[PDB]
Amino acid sequence: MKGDTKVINYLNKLLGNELVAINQYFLHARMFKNWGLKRLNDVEYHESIDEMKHADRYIERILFLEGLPNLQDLGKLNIGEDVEEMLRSDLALELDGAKNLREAIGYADSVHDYVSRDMMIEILRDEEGHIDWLETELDLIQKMGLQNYLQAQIRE
Amino acid sequence: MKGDTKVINYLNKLLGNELVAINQYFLHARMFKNWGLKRLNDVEYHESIDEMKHADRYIERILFLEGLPNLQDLGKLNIGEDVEEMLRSDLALELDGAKNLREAIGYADSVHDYVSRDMMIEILRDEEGHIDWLETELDLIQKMGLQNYLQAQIRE
Amino acid sequence: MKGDTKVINYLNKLLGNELVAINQYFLHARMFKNWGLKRLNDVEYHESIDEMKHADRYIERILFLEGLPNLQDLGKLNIGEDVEEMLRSDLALELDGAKNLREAIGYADSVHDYVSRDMMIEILRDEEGHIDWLETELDLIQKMGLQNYLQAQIRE
Amino acid sequence: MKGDTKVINYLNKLLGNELVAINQYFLHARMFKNWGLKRLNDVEYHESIDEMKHADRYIERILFLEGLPNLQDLGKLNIGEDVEEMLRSDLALELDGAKNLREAIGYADSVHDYVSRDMMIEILRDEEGHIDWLETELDLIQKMGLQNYLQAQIRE
Amino acid sequence: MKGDTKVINYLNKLLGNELVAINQYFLHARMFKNWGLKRLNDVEYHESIDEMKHADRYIERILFLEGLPNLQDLGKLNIGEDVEEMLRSDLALELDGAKNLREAIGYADSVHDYVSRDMMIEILRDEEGHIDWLETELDLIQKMGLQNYLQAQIRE
Amino acid sequence: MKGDTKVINYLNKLLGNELVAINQYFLHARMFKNWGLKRLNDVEYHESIDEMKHADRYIERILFLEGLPNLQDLGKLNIGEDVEEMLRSDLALELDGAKNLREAIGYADSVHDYVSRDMMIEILRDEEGHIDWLETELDLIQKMGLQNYLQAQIRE
Amino acid sequence: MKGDTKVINYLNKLLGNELVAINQYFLHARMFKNWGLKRLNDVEYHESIDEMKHADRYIERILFLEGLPNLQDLGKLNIGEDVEEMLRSDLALELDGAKNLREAIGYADSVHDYVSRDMMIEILRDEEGHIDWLETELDLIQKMGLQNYLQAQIRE
Ligand code: HEM
Ligand code: HEM
Ligand code: HEM
Ligand SMILES: [Zn+2]
Ligand SMILES: [Zn+2]
Ligand SMILES: [Zn+2]
Ligand SMILES: [Zn+2]
Ligand SMILES: [Zn+2]
Ligand SMILES: [Zn+2]
Ligand SMILES: [Zn+2]
Ligand SMILES: [Zn+2]
Ligand SMILES: [Zn+2]
Ligand SMILES: [Zn+2]
Ligand SMILES: [Zn+2]
Ligand SMILES: [Zn+2]
Ligand SMILES: [Zn+2]
Ligand SMILES: [Zn+2]
């Protein structure tokens, strides 16, 4: 089915977002794992998989709409060197992708691509979930302090 | 069976207490849950259910005694903004309801409504239980300090 | 995540609707139960739980959007004294809440809060279900007459 | 253990009440059964057993308190000739026994026989239950009319 | 295998009958379902499936006899607005299709298409069954009156 | 619940689309089955059922919105005489129904019938799926040629 | 443990290779899936996962050797527009990565990083496997011709 060109661009753009998220989350996961923060590796790893499912959904959609998925361009990774810095980076990224999702969803609706819209809304719901988690951890770090927070990540 | 009017008023009054408790506990639960204090959400949620069972018991009793359960009037909620403040509020409330229960129980006995009395005593036993729990948490917060207490609520 | 203020007000308003529904349905349930209309107690009770799940959804959402859930204000309960009157009251209430849901959903979409919107649409679908049921019972009462309808509620 | 004499008299008196209830309920049960009102035979039969458990409790208590259980004197049975009349009789009887229970309970407390009291309160709770049931059936008969009520008792 | 042309026309004609029956029965089913007459929705729905199996049988037969099944032409639906009217319509339709089946069966035999005949006879046996059911319900409505009949359809 | 009239017309129109799809797909299925293309009969048959579930959804919705489902009018079937021609016909039909779904969805949203909208979106997602399948088969026929394609349908 | 700097560069370089392979294989997989070549989607998808396991191994190794895994730089994807072209591209890529692996393995041995070496050898064994598969498919396409090859990918 020939899709709307601008919807495809959006889908590619969003795809692009998930592909930076996928890498940044996986690196973070294995950084935490290395440091022995087993619990943070577990969650961020599972978030990496999450972003991958998203990427796949865009890819299959672009192909269905007869567009060319762009996995060539990779946006800026921002890794960070300590837990806070790195959580905070993941959150800024999820925040930028939500902004992009909000725009794309609106546009899909206005060109009547309701199923792309529908898939985008479910994705944003997942993103909003990741946002929740990042915010919560970042706040726990302040309430209980960094040392206690770190100890709390040692077991899975 | 026509019940004693004043017993019905008491039962309504007590019902009224449980219905503020139900809401305050549920809000607290989901506040804790949002903050990531999984353990406190678990307990306060289960206390919300507890107060609901109580409310139901009064409702069925008032109806049996041929009175009109009043679910219209809702007493003052006091929510609080941090764990201590909020635990402390739940405790003041349980304390006021116990006082009311003590009064009502005495009166039921003196008009010979022994089964209302019996149901009230079992309820107060549950309340006293909630009082125990609130007091214990509040004391743990002092003994181990707030940061360690918070870390201790992260897992269920 | 800071939500849109007016979306939060809507969410609180809707929350407020569910909290009257929760009480009115529960009272009705136990009123029917008392009268021995076992079947009506079963359904309205299960509708009470239904409205509670809704309330919870709003609460967790308002908290996520960083607003303050208001469980303090309770709208007007209208109880009624016989089956019809009471069914008819539940229906007027579901009807007012659907109207509010329709208004809120539109607004969520226009400020791009697509996930609040999404949760609201699923809720309205449930409400519309309750509307169906109330309408159906009210019509059965006319087609088969009140006496036969009452007999039909004696067993679960 | 030598019990208080007046407590024993009360226990005997109450025993006496259960033994009329036992017979009246059983006769009613088998009257309903004969008429084909299977459902009413089921409940009243189970109430007969209920009263028997009560009788047993008094008997074992009187014997423990070193009194002589009197199963010789049997109060006035009032049978009735149709469903209503007969339900209405069972209800007047439960009502008289509740009155007696209330008096006895008060007295047990004042001579410090707290366990007799305790057993009496549990019994009265059961009685109050039977009262509920009789009242409910009697009201169903008015709401739905006698013919529909009778049809509703044909299956168990 | 080249079939007899007139047999194919008959098969198409009969097919045509089943395709009105299929729709009329399904609409009726969901009309009853909507009204809360759960029991009538269950049966008419299962009759819709029944007619579909019939249609399929004709279709596969026409194709085997090398004819073109006509699913394009749809006879007159007669829906009705109340239970009786609608049952009575389903019955007139089954009656017309039985008449057509009787004619077709005779003709198949006389051109030696014994297997088409055989399949038609089994179908007519099913139809005759549906006729039985419709007649019986229509008579129950008179014997027990409409109100009692309606109550009797509330549970499945 | 009284629905918006134009929404009902749309729902009827869409219903009408599914009812041509149901027949065309079933005929195609049994045409393939007859030709021994077991694999195509399996899929198109399962698509026929799919369209039937859709029809049912519209029917129950129209009835809920207090409209009259029209199963009387049947649009133009286009059958075709060979695999390609017939696949190509099914695709043109799915394409016209998607167009209609897109218009109806927009309109539902603008009159606030969000649940009709919601059901329509899920349907369109299924349709879009059928579109995918038809397009894919049509392209396989070109890539691998007709003879190889036919052989590939012989087993299920 | 501080690793040898040049070993880390190699590990990063190789990592870089797996991350182009991961994307190219996944796109290919879903391209085949879209075209209905179910069998090729299955294998290339499983090769994508394979390359991901590899990437993970490098990442955990670089982190253990105290280096910074570079997931930022992404080499040139070469996608292709038909099966052959695309298989042929995957093969050229596996061939370049094997060359790099051979170089790195030698160097690891000469600086005594025998475990990095060991992990690299196991990886190359997997790569050599993928090479085998690509070569085999490419040859089957010539022996049996493109049409027959395509038909052979339709089922999993
Ligand atoms: C380039 C950095 C990546 C790394 C290090 C990585 C790592 C992993 C790992 C370790 C797994 C678990 C293997 C398993 O399923 O058992 C996995 C699963 C998966 N990956 Fe990736 N991945 C990456 C990128 C991608 C990309 C770009 C895609 C394509 C959208 C993708 C798609 C998938 C899918 C669909 C699964 C299966 C999920 C499941 O069912 O568990 N990955 N990945
Ligand atoms: C208005 C604020 C309330 C909220 C947010 C709330 C929430 C909940 C939730 C989430 C559940 C679990 C659902 C389940 O049973 O699986 C529940 C259960 C229940 N609620 Fe409420 N509730 C509220 C008020 C009430 C009231 C006023 C009553 C009536 C006395 C009530 C009676 C019950 C009962 C009987 C259960 C079943 C307990 C069980 O067996 O688990 N609730 N409530
Ligand atoms: C007129 C041509 C039709 C034919 C030849 C046909 C054929 C069939 C067949 C063979 C089945 C399988 C029976 C089973 O469920 O075991 C079926 C199922 C079904 N049909 Fe039809 N059908 C037709 C039209 C319709 C229509 C107009 C509706 C109403 C919307 C409908 C609704 C259904 C439903 C709800 C099922 C059950 C699906 C399931 O759970 O498997 N059909 N049909
Ligand atoms: Zn994502
Ligand atoms: Zn995310
Ligand atoms: Zn309580
Ligand atoms: Zn309490
Ligand atoms: Zn609700
Ligand atoms: Zn509702
Ligand atoms: Zn007794
Ligand atoms: Zn009794
Ligand atoms: Zn038939
Ligand atoms: Zn029939
Ligand atoms: Zn459809
Ligand atoms: Zn379709
Ligand atoms: Zn590799
Ligand atoms: Zn490889």
For chain C, the farthest-separated pair of C-alpha atoms sits apart, in whole angstroms, at 55
For residue F75, report the phi and psi dihedrals to the nearest 5 degrees: -65, 180
Q: Tokens 């198109």 — which residue? A: F44
| Way the structure was solved | X-ray
| Cα–Cα distance, G105 to G121 (Å, whole number) | 7
Q: Does B136 touch chain A (CB under 8 A)?
A: no
F132 chain-A contacts, CB cut-off 8 A = 1, 64
C1·A131 Cβ contact <8 A? yes
Q: Do A139 and B35 touch (CB under 8 A)?
A: yes
Query: At residue F132, what is the residue type?
Result: D
Q: Which DSSP string do the residues of D54-104 spell out, in sequence order?
A: HHHHHHHHHHHTT-----S--------SSHHHHHHHHHHHHHHHHHHHHHH
Which residue minimizes the CA distance to atom 41 of ligand 2? B49
The rounded distance, in Å, linking the Cα atoms of D85 and C113 is 65
| 3-state percent helix, strand, coil for chain E, nearest multiple of 5 | 80, 0, 20
**What whole-number distance in Å separates Cα of residue C147 and Cα of residue D60?**
47
Alpha-carbon distance F150 to F152, whole Å? 5
- Interface contact flag, G72 A71, Cβ < 8 Å: no
The tokens for E142 are 């008179």
What b-and-e string marks burial along B54-77, b requiring 16 or more CB atoms within 10 Å of the CB?
A: bbbbbbbbbbbbebebbbbebbeb
Please say whether the beta carbons of F156 and F41 come within 8 A: no
Residue C151, token pair as written in the block: 């007999």
Rounded CA separation A63/A78 (Å): 30
Residue nearest to atom 14 of ligand 1 (CA): G49
- Distance in Å from the first CA to the final CA of chain F: 46
* Cα–Cα nearest to A73, from A12, A117, A30: A12
Q: Is there a contact between E24 and E78 (Cβ–Cβ < 8 Å)?
A: yes
CA distance G39 to B21: 60
Measuring CA to CA, how many Å separate A124 from each of A15, A51, A64, G127? Answer: 13, 11, 21, 37
Neighbours of chain A (3+ CB pairs under 8 A): B, C, F, G
Could you give the dihedral angle defined by the CA atoms of residues F45, F51, F52 and F55, in that order, rounded to the nearest 10 degrees? -170
Structure tokens at B148: 């360690």
Copy the structure tokens of residue A144: 């209980």
d(CA E64, CA B62): 74
What are the residue ranges spanned by the domains of chain A?
1-156
Are the beta carbons of B1 and C34 closer than 8 angstroms? no
Q: What is the amino acid identity at position E155?
A: R
Phi-psi region of G129 (alpha: psi -120 to 50; beta: other; left: phi over 0): alpha
Q: Which of C39, C128, C142, C143 to mutate to test binding with chain E, by most E CBs within 10 Å of its CB?
A: C143
**Which CATH architecture group holds A1-156?**
Up-down Bundle (1.20)
Q: Which atom of ligand 2 is nearest to the CA of C55?
A: 5
Nearest CA to ligand 2 atom 13: C49
Q: With beta carbons less than 8 A apart as the criterion, state whether C143 and E147 touch.
A: yes
Stated as kind and residue range, the H or E segment containing B71 is none
Q: Does D66 touch chain B (CB under 8 A)?
A: no
Name the DSSP class of B23.
H
Dihedral angle sign, alpha carbons of residues B50, B51, B54, B56: negative
DSSP tag of D113 = -
| Closest residue of chain A to B155, computed from CA coordinates | A152
Structure tokens given for C149: 């309808």
Which residue puts its alpha carbon closest to atom 2 of ligand 1? A23
Q: Which residue has the tokens 């100890």?
A: A151
Amino acid at the residue D9: N
What is the full DSSP assignment across chain F?
----HHHHHHHHHHHHHHHHHHHHHHHHHHHHHHHT-HHHHHHHHHHHHHHHHHHHHHHHHHHHTT-----S--------SSHHHHHHHHHHHHHHHHHHHHHHHHHHHHTT-HHHHHHHHHHHHHHHHHHHHHHHHHHHHHHH-HHHHHHTTS--
- Three-state SS string across C11-33, please? HHHHHHHHHHHHHHHHHHHHHHH
Between CA C62 and CA C71 the distance in angstroms is: 12
Q: Are F103 and F14 in contact (CB under 8 A)?
A: no
**Measuring CA to CA, which residue among D126, C31, C46 is closest to residue B60?**
C31
User: Whole-angstrom Cα distance, residue B40 to residue B31?
Assistant: 9
Nearest to C46 by CA among C61, C34, C60, C28: C28
Cα dist from A81 to A85, A155, D119, whole Å = 7, 22, 71
Query: What is the rounded distance in angstroms from the CA atom of residue B32 to the CA atom of residue B24?
Result: 12
Among E37, E151, E153, E156, most C C-beta atoms within 10 A, so best to mutate, is E151
Token couple for E24: 């009329």
Identify which of D125, D126, D153 has the alpha carbon closest to the alpha carbon of residue D141.
D153
How far is residue E71's CA from residue F105's CA, in Å, rounded to a whole number? 29
Ligand 2 pocket, residue B49 CB under 6 Å: yes
- What is the largest distance, in Å, between two alpha-carbon atoms of chain D? 55
CA–CA gap between residue F131 and residue F155 (Å, rounded): 23
Tokens standing for G43?
A: 């294998």
- The amino acid present at C114, given as its one-letter code, is Y
Q: For tokens 């690196």, what's the residue?
A: A27
Distance from CA of A55 to the nearest CA of B (A): 28
Q: Could you give the maximum distance between any two Cα atoms of chain F, in Å?
A: 55
Protein residues within 5 Å, CB atom, of ion ligand 11: D 94, 127, 130
Inter-chain touch C1–A124, beta carbons under 8 Å: no
CA R_g for chain G: 17
Q: Tell me how far the alpha carbon of residue G134 lies from the centroid of ligand 17, in angstroms.
A: 10
- Taking the mean position of all CA atoms in its chain, how far away is CA G88? 13
Provide the CB-side half-sphere exposure for C73 (13 A, CA): 10
Q: Confirm if E54 and E47 have CB atoms less than 8 A apart.
A: no
Nearest alpha carbon to residue C64 among C56, C52, C72, C53: C56
Kindly report the nearest CA distance between residue D102 and chain B, in angstroms.
Answer: 6
- CA-to-CA distance for G5 and C70, rounded, in angstroms? 60
Atom number, ligand 1, closest to the C-alpha of residue A56:
30
Q: Which amino acid is at E120?
A: M
Give the 3-state secondary structure of residue C155. coil
- Alpha-carbon distance D49 to D22, whole Å? 7
Rounded Cα–Cα distance for residues E155 and C152 (Å): 9
| Residue pair B6/B65 in contact by the 8 Å Cβ criterion | no
Q: Which tokens hold the place of E121? A: 């006879």
Q: Which long-range contacts (CB under 8 A, 24 or more apart) does G2-5 make?
A: G2/G65, G2/G66, G3/G62, G3/G64, G3/G65, G3/G66, G3/G67, G3/G113, G3/G116, G4/G65, G4/G111, G4/G113, G5/G67
Instruction: Return d(Cα F3, Cα G4) in angstroms, integer.
Output: 74
DSSP assignment, residue C72? S
Mutate to test the pocket of ligand 1, among A14, A22, A30 (most ligand atoms within 8 A of CB): A22
B141 vs C39: CA distance, rounded Å: 48
Contact E154 C152 (CB under 8 A): yes
B/e letters for F18-46, b = 16+ CB within 10 Å, e = fewer, are bbbbbbbbbbbbbbbbebebebbbebbbe
- List CB contacts (< 8 A) between A60 and chain G: 30, 33-34
For chain A, state the CA radius of gyration: 17
| Residue linked to tokens 């299925």 | F29
- Chain G residues whose CB is inside 8 A of the A30 CB are 56, 59-60, 63, 69
Q: How far apart are the first and last CA of chain D?
A: 46
Cβ pair E61, E69 in contact under 8 A = no
Look at residues D110, F65, G41 and name the one whose alpha carbon lies nearest to residue C135: F65
Phi, psi of C60 (to 5 degrees): -70, -25
CA geometry: angle A31, A33, A37, nearest 5 deg: 105
The 10 Å Cβ neighbour count of residue A64 is 20
φ/ψ bin of G3: left (φ > 0), alpha (ψ from -120 to 50), beta (otherwise): beta
Nearest protein Cα to ligand 3, atom 42: F52
Instruction: Kindly report the backbone phi and psi dihedral angles of residue G49, in degrees, each rounded to the nearest multiple of 5, phi listed first.
Output: -60, -45
CA distance C128 to C109: 20
Instruction: Please give the C-alpha separations between residue C66 and each of B30, C7, C70, in angstroms, as whole numbers.
Output: 12, 11, 13
Q: How far apart are CA E9 and CA D149, in angstroms?
A: 57
User: How far is ligand 5, taken at its centre, from the CA of residue A134, in Å?
Assistant: 10
CA distances from F32 to B77, F108, G78, G155 (A): 69, 38, 41, 19
Are residues C150 and D139, on separate chains, in Cβ contact within 8 Å? no
Residue that is written with structure tokens 């298989």 in the block = G87
Query: Residue F70 contacts by C-beta under 8 Å, 6 or more apart in sequence?
Result: F12, F15, F16
By C-alpha distance, which of B87, B77, B78, B85 is closest to B131?
B87
Verify whether ligand 3 is closer than 6 Å to residue E68 (CB atom).
no
Of B114, B18, B111, B1, give the one whose Cα is nearest residue B66.
B1
Cα separation, F64 vs C111, in Å, equals 31
In chain A, residues with a C-beta closer than 8 Å to the C-beta of C112 are: 102, 105-106
Q: Which two tokens stand for residue D110?
A: 């004042």
Please tell me if residue A144 touches chain B, with a CB cutoff of 8 Å. yes
- CB proximity list for G65: less than 8 A, separation 6 or greater: G1, G2, G3, G4, G7, G8, G11, G116
How far apart CA E7 and CA A55 sit, in angstroms, is 58
Largest separation between any pair of C-alpha atoms in chain E: 55
Contacts of C19 in chain B (CB under 8 A): 23
Distance CA A23, CA A29 (A): 10
The CA distance from A12 to A71, in Å, is 8
Say if residues D80 and D24 touch (Cβ distance below 8 Å). no
